[PDB]
Design a protein around this ligand. Structure first.
Ligand SMILES: Nc1ncnc2c1ncn2[C@@H]1O[C@H](COP(=O)(O)OP(=O)(O)O)[C@@H](O)[C@H]1O
Ligand SMILES: Nc1ncnc2c1ncn2[C@@H]1O[C@H](COP(=O)(O)OP(=O)(O)O)[C@@H](O)[C@H]1O
Lengths: 577, 459, 43, 239, 193, 386
């Protein structure tokens, strides 16, 4: 095909010689072991091998042979309930052939070749088709797992095997075109499979963290970003989505995140129930995990595969939630190549490509009608990590002003003890107006007004905060200390959930909505308390405050009536005193 | 076997010799002198026509007329054997004590290969270690890679030693004997002081814990470069003691700040890029492999818990060493000058100690059911606490209300009674007792973070 | 004011000094690229 | 320089505050410093359509002069790309405007030329036929983000805080498309609206502008948090 | 080359009260004036030439946000000498240069003005140079030093900015011509950050 | 020997060609009037020289010769009192032959060669020794000075001169190997000197000056810094540290401190009286002063002499105080050497191998049991200046 040998091997990169006719970015095998390569530069006939795994133990003058396909995960039915290396290798089988070591020199298959499956067809043979037109529905768990024409294929059918178990590899469709569709179909990664067309979004991506659903929120096509220094909950706020999002598929993938946080979701996740079936929640799950410890270059691979997976599922028709855990390391990874190939860099040494390969990523999708005429959403909420705390640093900032919905996760907040506390005096979402329809109808018809008044206090409260630190809470009188305290409670109780309290760690709108109406009331009547002639001073020390306190803890079932009880308790417990 | 000559350039700890063409990137080769002394060095950049050797020692007097380089192993591997258990070894290790050479029962690659994450097993076990802070708030667990962020004048080493001395599982909140866990230690040094040596050694001799334990050494006055081999070495003696022979082993890698220092040197003396603060940017990876081996394997037995102690300069927390450690290990606990002036020993603060693996193995027949809510309350109070330490010192000498008075009153308290402690060890239970005693002082109806039953249960 | 002022400057000069070295270091890289490829002219 | 004729004319916007207190005069550049998340865009596209110069109040025949809004954003999301086109088509005014809008993802190179396009196209309006143009470029943060990459590869050493040395110049020339020129009656308005990252007035990208563009009209959180729209402060701001 | 610098000791009129009585500059003096704009600073510059005490006016700054640079151009012909009733532009010489203008143009800009001033000076008159946008002056300098790879230093303006900046001022005072007469070269330093 | 000549000259750097098998790090006389350098880089056949003198005026073509021996100090008796400076030349004799300036490149002996001495051999022929033994005492001031056998030398004894008047040159002890075990010996600065064991500290080292001592003492061996801005104590607290004591000898090596800044050191000193045995204080000092304007690089050498003098002395039982003040200087040294040798710095220009050598300089001090089984401890008290 095209073959040469090692000329210069030193570091994760190598330079082979005796090569020509290569193409940019192409998988290869290097060393006697065979390891998985990439073409990333040419210079006459010598080529920079980028070598996906480790190295060590190599000699100069060993195989170097390309096949000339440029990366791609082979996508088809049966992928859930697994874990996948950076080139989608199922570690199960690996573990079964090794022991307890990720060892080089490994080759297996992406989708297992044994299991056969219950087929069903749609179209009759002797029919016409065009790109991405649905064909067969193999069932798969609580899902219905369709199969499409691989994009950019068109023609006319000629046979169709009827129902029964059938292999993954099998050609179960023949064409009058001499072509063959088999169950899966391989698709690159650098490209970006089209869809029928692009369209606006308006459906909220529910999430159940009050803080991500009453204040800042996200569109369905949403793109956002979450940052915060080390020890800030960065991971855990993606944990919750992975077990309380509201869609078909969580596709949690993290690159450069430790084992411990991964494996845990593989021993807890079996025993839980989804809000959309009742089954083991692990059905809507991917995990393409590729922890820090592993190779260098894999950290680059990793993401773009799970972007693609994000398309692949959307494609069938569902509602992708992809979230990359800790994309920033990716930058570091990219830049480690750089160093060795000698590319002068831009600030903070990142090679100038920060935008180049960022900006393509995040733009990707949301509510986009498919070739199949389904409603496709790509939901990404990117995690990032700065390396300082200085948000001024480039790789961070470049995220803003490429995507909307910015949440910032304050650092000094969290040292105390809340979670997943954010600064809402940093943060800002954009998506928040085009959510109004759905909210009105679905939730309550007066909700957005009732929320803006909450921000009315909340963002105004700093107005006083500063003056507190300029002359104490002393000599701030009473419409003064009203607010301070109201709001004090507003974050003490409306902004801090957990991810470990047994219940109360997920909410419906309508519940949350409830909590939120109370407080307004309490503000209102208090406003009329002091104006009438009494004082907050004791009002704080009313028993009824603490009822508003503990409040969040009761569950839904009780919730209506809980809430109704305070609805009595208010009007009496003001007028009396 | 064989033998090269063809040097061209020597300067710094980087060596150069040509026409070699059959080594491998990562190979212990030798540096036979033209006088009689051998040294060892690494093949870290091998080209078609020259290559890098990486001298593992100081260089002195070497020529451009003789000298021999010599392939010792293709890929670095060292032996291991449960034989050793009371030895010393230097940098690469060539046993130092005047006792016999080793016997290996395996050879093992020094790099190791990182753990398949499926192969990880869920950590869980809780241990008793004594020194409240940890044992209440953050709590060490068998397998948490924890590092104790230290300054300098703060006593880094001392505090470590207690842990070496009181770590012990509960056998009663679990169903096993105590003749199921004693312990084991594997210490390592990477360039320390001599005075730090002896202090160390005697506390192994006085517990008589010195045996059943290997401690590698490297003082800070030996060769510079061998700073980058040694850590891993010991850790690789760790997999061996851990996995096939079953043990629980607390490993102390005290001081890591000399690590990156030496690391830096090779870095830039070659040409790789900087990447914040002039530490070579690929740091992240090299500092993955050291801490990341550890944990608890599946359906297995054994344990590797690492506590290494950083010594970042000043009381900064953005000097990039402790930086990246932060992601890397899970959580940390900090010593701070902040306390130290007051004389409270052994200082710790809660305020920036996280400890990730904690919501596992706690309370559920693993500690008293009060724990979950204890910590966050007691925690948050103190947070709340020192806060008014400031507002007070600005407005007046006080002007606080009689609600808020109670807060400040507990400030001095918390630090002083509870976080101070003698050598006098504590137990999980006696600790807790105290714990409630500092929650006692605030009046009820101020503790929202605890729930109504638990609060009254032991008020 | 005149103190916390006095801190701020201190940030400035050090934040700045950071990058002098940045460039100077970076400069040298160029030197290499050109010197190096001046003998990938060969002959 | 001689050719240019001193401004003296007026332009309404259709927004209030930015006409009453601090008034966009005609043949004038001026920019709206936004914050990170305050909503620039909307306050853009209003002032897109709305404006119409009333010559009326000064005295002369109405349709002696018509109005052209020339618009160019960049680094727009599939999302943003749609908020324009919806508003634009709504009551329509596409039929009196030109589009140019270089998608976010789109190659970084063309980005660089992109504005220069809609600038030069603007010339052909007023100088060869007389017209009254309003050019509104957007997000020049992007303009430099994108810029840097080019220079970083094509070689140079970046000067102060990045932002390649020859910025001053390069940025200058994307603003000399303005003013009236004696005899000739039509002219260009610039309003380029951009966002800072450091939320300052000290980071160079905006600061720089503030030496060659002539004023400043900020948007604060304050207004916006309390929920107003379009939040343009008073006092920070002045032409 | 000139033949004897001579000590300052010569008044300089400007007529402005506040100018001379309190803060004279002396002829051959050398001053500088900052002044945020949007605050009437050009006023002075106008009046400056208007009375003067010299008789040759050279005003030349270089680069200044478009429109204001055009203001100079327009108001200049309107003002008239109040010493002969002759149109003011008659005894004048302006060099302009607007932001956008080519880089190494701008760098030379001052120097231009400086030379030309010397010429006229040499003829025995008393002269009056003005220049503004010295603060911007350095700009070009940065730029040139961008495109030449010489490290910066200090804040960001290369080092020479304690010299070329210097020389711009030295050349002035009370020169005595080779023609044996006396010729005024005061420069008053606008700057503006 | 080996010959060669020049390739470029740069500041105080020099390169040379024509070498082959030049050893790494040595005494390298180059320059017609000699210069005595140190070999850092060895490239090719082209030896990078270092030179500790103002290189003003060299041509291209001079000899390059080596001795195949690192830079090293003669150690023995005849130490205490006198100046020796960084490159170990005792200024005394220089002062004396050459007027009032340093005329670079003058070669001289170090430790004298003409003063006579009474010797008592303390061991008889054919008997055993380990290296580091004492062979004989000699009258050195109020001191039981000993003549220590060099380590890594051992052998039986063929003869041993009896008592009498001698100079040190003379072999006093011929080893039974036909090895003229001379009085004093050469032990290169780099490296340290082995010892039987380091023994914990516990004994105070006072200094007497109150505050400094009573509250924040130091232990007998140990180490501590003095950072501090300019314009506070540094230059003269050490001086008072020296003039009072709590140990024997004082080997003091300043570096690049002004003419007056150690003038005064010298001249006042002969007048004070030891509070340990009485007597004039020169009797326990070592001067390694160093003019500020001295050859830039020669500070790096200078500190290292100091410390190695201290060990030697330590092995003779005593307690040695060495407080080379000002490590910032040392810094500067390397700070320049890098720049020449063209290496990408790290943080603020210092080469990264700073704590490379730094570490060791602090290490060697301590308290020990030597080969002679003698107590002794070198104390170091560092001063730094950012
Ligand atoms: N929702 C929560 N409830 C309780 N504790 C939390 C919550 N979120 C975070 N924390 C605590 O704070 C820690 C911060 O999360 P962490 O895993 O360190 O995130 P990262 O390191 O990715 O920023 C958690 O490990 C947990 O102990
Ligand atoms: N703290 C002190 N109080 C009074 N005078 C002092 C004090 N310390 C030193 N001096 C004087 O200040 C002079 C300056 O020298 P010194 O403080 O030793 O070091 P340097 O000026 O090099 O920092 C001393 O020579 C001494 O005369």
């Amino acid at each position: 095909m095209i073959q040469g040998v090692i000329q210069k091997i030193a570091g994760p990169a190598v330079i082979a010689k005796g090569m020509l006719g290569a193409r940019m970015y192409d998988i290869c095998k290097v060393g006697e072991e065979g390891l998985v390569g990439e073409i990333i530069r040419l210079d006459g006939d010598t080529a920079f091998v980028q070598v996906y795994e480790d190295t060590s133990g190599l000699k100069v003058g060993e195989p170097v042979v390309s096949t000339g396909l440029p990366l791609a995960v082979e996508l088809g039915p049966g992928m859930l309930n697994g874990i996948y290396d950076g080139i989608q290798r199922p570690l199960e089988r690996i573990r079964e052939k090794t022991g307890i070591y990720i060892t080089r020199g490994v080759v297996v298959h992406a989708l297992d070749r044994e299991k056969k499956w219950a087929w069903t067809p749609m179209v009759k043979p002797g029919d016409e088709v065009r790109g991405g037109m649905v064909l067969g529905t193999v069932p798969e768990f609580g899902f219905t797992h369709k199969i499409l024409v691989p994009p950019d294929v068109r023609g006319r059918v000629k046979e169709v095997k009827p129902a029964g178990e059938y292999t993954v590899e099998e050609p179960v469709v023949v064409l009058e075109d001499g072509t063959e569709l088999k169950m899966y179909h391989t698709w690159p990664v650098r490209r970006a499979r089209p869809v029928q067309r692009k369209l606006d979004p308006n459906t909220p991506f529910l999430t159940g963290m009050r803080i991500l659903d009453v204040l800042f929120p996200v569109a369905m096509g949403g793109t956002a970003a979450i940052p915060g220094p080390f020890g800030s909950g960065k991971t855990v706020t993606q944990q919750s989505l992975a077990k309380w999002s509201n869609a078909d598929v969580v596709v949690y993938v993290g690159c450069g995140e430790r084992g411990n946080e991964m494996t845990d979701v593989l021993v807890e996740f079996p025993e839980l129930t989804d809000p959309k079936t009742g089954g083991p929640l692990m059905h809507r799950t991917v995990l393409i995990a590729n922890t820090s410890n592993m190779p260098v270059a894999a950290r680059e691979a990793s993401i773009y595969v799970g972007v693609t997976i994000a398309e692949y599922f959307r494609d069938q028709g569902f509602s992708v939630a992809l979230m990359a855990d800790s994309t920033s390391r990716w930058a570091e990874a990219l830049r480690e190549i750089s160093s060795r190939l000698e590319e002068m860099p831009a600030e903070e040494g990142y090679p100038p490509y920060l935008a180049a390969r960022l900006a393509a990523f995040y733009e990707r999708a949301g509510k986009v009608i498919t070739l199949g005429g389904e409603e496709g959403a790509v939901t990404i909420v990117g995690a990032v990590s700065p390396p300082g705390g200085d948000m001024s640093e480039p790789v961070t900032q470049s995220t803003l002003r490429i995507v909307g919905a910015f949440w910032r996760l304050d650092a000094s907040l969290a040292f105390r003890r809340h979670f997943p506390a954010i600064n809402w005096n940093g943060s800002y979402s954009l998506f928040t107006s085009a959510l109004d329809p759905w909210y009105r109808e679905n939730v309550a018809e007066d909700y957005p007004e009732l929320r803006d008044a909450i921000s009315e206090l909340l963002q105004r409260e700093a107005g006083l905060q500063e003056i507190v630190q300029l002359v104490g809470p002393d000599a701030l009188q009473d419409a003064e200390r009203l607010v301070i305290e109201v709001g004090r409670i507003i974050r003490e109780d409306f902004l801090q959930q957990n991810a470990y309290h047994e219940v109360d760690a997920y909410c419906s709108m309508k519940k949350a909505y409830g909590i939120m109406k109370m407080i307004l009331a309490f503000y209102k009547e208090a406003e009329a308390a002091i104006k009438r002639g009494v004082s907050i001073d004791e009002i704080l020390q009313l028993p009824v405050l603490e009822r508003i306190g503990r409040a969040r803890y009761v569950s839904e079932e009780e919730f209506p009536a809980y809430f109704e009880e305070a609805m009595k308790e208010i009007q009496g417990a003001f007028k009396a005193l | 076997k064989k033998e090269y000559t063809g040097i061209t350039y020597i300067s710094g700890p980087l060596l150069f010799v040509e026409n070699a063409k059959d080594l491998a990137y990562g190979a212990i080769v030798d540096i036979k002198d033209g006088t009689g002394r051998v040294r060892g060095g690494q093949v870290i950049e091998v080209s078609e026509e020259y290559a890098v050797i990486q001298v593992f020692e100081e260089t002195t007097g070497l020529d451009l007329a003789t000298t021999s380089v010599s392939l010792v192993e293709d890929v670095a591997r060292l032996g291991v054997s449960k034989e050793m258990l009371g030895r010393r070894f230097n940098g690469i290790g060539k046993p130092i004590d005047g006792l016999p050479p080793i016997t290996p029962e395996k050879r093992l690659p020094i790099t190791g290969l990182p753990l398949n994450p499926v192969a990880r097993r869920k950590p869980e076990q809780f241990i008793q270690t004594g020194i409240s802070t940890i044992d209440v708030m953050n709590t060490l667990v068998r397998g948490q890679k924890l590092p104790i962020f230290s300054g300098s004048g703060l006593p880094a080493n001392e505090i470590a030693a207690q842990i070496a001395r009181q770590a012990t599982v509960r056998p009663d909140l679990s169903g096993e004997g105590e003749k199921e866990e004693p312990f084991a230690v594997v210490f390592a040094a990477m360039g320390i002081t001599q005075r730090e040596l002896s202090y160390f050694i005697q506390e192994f001799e006085r517990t008589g814990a010195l045996s059943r334990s290997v401690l590698f050494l490297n003082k800070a006055d030996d060769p510079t470069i061998e700073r980058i081999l040694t850590p891993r070495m010991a850790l690789t003696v760790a997999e061996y003691l851990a996995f096939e022979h079953d043990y629980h082993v607390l490993v102390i890698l005290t001081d890591m700040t000399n690590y990156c220092e030496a690391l830096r040197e090779i870095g830039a003396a070659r040409e790789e890029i900087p990447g914040r603060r002039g530490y070579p940017g690929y740091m992240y990876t090299d500092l993955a492999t050291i801490y990341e081996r550890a944990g608890v394997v599946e359906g297995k037995k054994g344990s590797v818990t690492q506590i290494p102690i950083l010594s970042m300069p000043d009381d900064d927390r953005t000097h990039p060493i402790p930086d990246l450690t932060g992601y890397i290990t899970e959580g940390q606990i900090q010593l701070s000058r902040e306390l130290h002036r007051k004389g409270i020993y052994p200082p710790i603060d809660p305020l920036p100690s996280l400890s990730r693996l904690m919501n596992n193995g706690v309370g559920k027949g693993k500690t008293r059911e009060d724990h979950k809510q204890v910590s966050d309350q007691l925690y948050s109070a103190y947070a709340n606490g020192v806060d008014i330490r400031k507002l007070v010192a600005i407005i007046g000498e006080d002007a606080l209300t009689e609600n808020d008075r109670r807060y400040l009153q507990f400030a001095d308290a918390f630090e002083r009674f509870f976080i101070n402690q003698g050598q006098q060890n504590r137990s999980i239970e006696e600790s807790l007792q105290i714990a409630w005693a500092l929650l006692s002082m605030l009046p009820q109806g101020e503790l929202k973070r605890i729930s109504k039953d638990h609060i009254g249960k032991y008020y | 004011i005149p103190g916390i002022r006095a801190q701020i400057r201190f940030i400035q000069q050090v934040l700045e000094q950071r990058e002098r070295e940045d460039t100077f270091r970076l400069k040298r890289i160029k030197g290499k690229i050109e010197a190096r490829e001046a003998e990938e002219e060969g002959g």
